[PDB]
With several copies, the nearest count.
Chain A
Amino acid sequence: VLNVHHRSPSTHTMAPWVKRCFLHKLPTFLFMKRRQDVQEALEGVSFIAQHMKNDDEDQSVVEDWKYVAMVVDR
C-alpha cells in the first residue's frame, strides 16, 4: 500500500476497475465521505495556460492515488 502511494501519471495509468471500485463503493462503505510581435504573445500565454492545466490534471491524479492508498490502508 506504500507502493500505490507514489504512482504518477508519467509512469502508471489508472485502470477502470480501480477507478470504479476504490472511489465509489468502499469509501461509502468504510465511512470516508471524501502585429507580428503581438501574435507570438498570445501563443506564449496559451502555452502557459495549457501547461498549468496539465499540471493541475497531474496533481489531481496523484491526489487520486493518495486517496486510493488511504482507502486500502483503512
Chain B
Amino acid sequence: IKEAIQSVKYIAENMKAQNEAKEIQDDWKYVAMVIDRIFLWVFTLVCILGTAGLFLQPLM
C-alpha cells in the first residue's frame, strides 16, 4: 500500500537524477563546441594570413 507510493517517489527521484546528469553531459558538449569555434577562428585567420603574406605578395 505504502510501497507503491514510495515506488512513485523513487521513480521521481530517479528521473530528477537522470535529468541532472543529462545537464552535466550537455555542459561537456557545449565546452567542446566552444573550443571548436575558437580554434576555427584562429586557424581561419592563420590560413588567410599565410596565403596572403607568403604566396601572392612576394610573387607579384
Contact, chains A and B (beta carbon distance below 8 A): yes
Cross-chain contact A48 with B30 (CB below 8 angstroms): no
Cross-chain contact B29 with A11 (CB below 8 angstroms): yes
Q: List 29 A-B contacts (CB under 8 A).
A: A8-B26, A10-B29, A10-B30, A11-B26, A11-B29, A11-B33, A37-B2, A37-B5, A38-B5, A40-B5, A40-B9, A41-B5, A41-B9, A42-B3, A42-B4, A45-B8, A45-B12, A46-B3, A46-B4, A46-B7, A47-B15, A48-B11, A49-B7, A49-B10, A49-B11, A51-B15, A51-B19, A52-B10, A56-B14
Q: What sequence of 0s and 1s flags, for each residue 43-63 of chain A, a beta carbon within 8 Å of any chain B beta carbon?
A: 111111101100010000000
Is the interface on chain B under 10, 10 to 19, 20 to 34, or 35 or more residues? 10 to 19
A-side contacts of B29, CB under 8 Å = 10-11
A-B pairs with CB below 8 Å: how many? 47
Please list the residues of chain A having a beta carbon within 8 angstroms of any beta carbon in chain B.
Answer: 8, 10-11, 37-38, 40-49, 51-52, 56
- Given A10-B30, A11-B33, A42-B4, do A48 and B9 touch, yes or no (CB 8 Å)? no
Please list the residues of chain B having a beta carbon within 8 angstroms of any beta carbon in chain A.
Answer: 1-5, 7-12, 14-16, 19, 26, 29-30, 33
CB of A50 to closest CB in B, whole Å: 8
